């Protein structure tokens, strides 16, 4: 009943997630609502980038899941959490991320661009918990219906893979904790990187992720490859 291409997800992710006909409908209805909203408002990112994160990663090659809130809201959003097009300045959140890598990861030097696609090809999944935002208004799609979808993805990665690392940054990312199997994975939590939980400055998530990865005979992430 559902043309799987209307789901926008790469097909490796369709089979991995193996959404029921019901959940595919639920997703299609949300996608339709977003389209209708685009007639009155500007929504970021473009419709064709909402699932960009599925096109960069085969789901089995995931090593690290990084989870954000909602997309950048002033043009910068690419479809990958925290990443920016080369047309745009590195926003405060990514500058702060780089500052932590600069301070913590040997030979990391801060790039003049904010493109995180290199992390994606090394098996870092850069996921927002809410995949859209109205231009200008931060958090403005918070209760529109993305949450079941991103929660479903996090659960499936946790159930289907072994020994991934999840870096959960800020309250909404951290809410997904109960979905991740404590006997198989590592979760590291911090306060959100933009200026209750541990401070982001000093969290050392990047070296800790790699420590865990190397320990499970998996290949590290080269965070400085950008």
Author numbering: 19 to 213, 223 to 253
Copied sentences from the primary study:
Efficient γ-herpesvirus lytic phase replication requires a virally encoded UNG-type uracil-DNA glycosylase as a structural element of the viral replisome. Uniquely, γ-herpesvirus UNGs carry a seven or eight residue insertion of variable sequence in the otherwise highly conserved minor-groove DNA binding loop. The UNG leucine loop is a conserved structural feature which is responsible for widening the DNA minor groove and flipping pyrimidines out of the base stack and, in the case of uracil, into the UNG active site for catalysis. kUNG, in common with other known UNGs, comprises a single C-terminal globular domain made up of a four-stranded parallel β-sheet flanked by six α-helices, with an additional left-handed coil of three helices at the N-terminus.
The structure of kUNG in its apo form was solved in two different crystal forms. The disc-shaped structure of the leucine loop extension centred on the side chain of Q212 was not observed in the two unbound kUNG structures. Taken together, the unbound kUNG structures suggest that the leucine loop extension is highly flexible in solution. However, the absence of electron density for the leucine loop insertion in the apo kUNG C2 crystal form, and partial ordering of the leucine loop along with significant crystal contacts in the P21 crystal form indicate that the leucine loop is very likely highly mobile in solution. Mutagenesis suggests a model in which the kUNG loop is pinned outside the DNA-binding cleft until DNA docking promotes rigid structuring of the loop and duplex nucleotide flipping, a novel observation for UNGs.
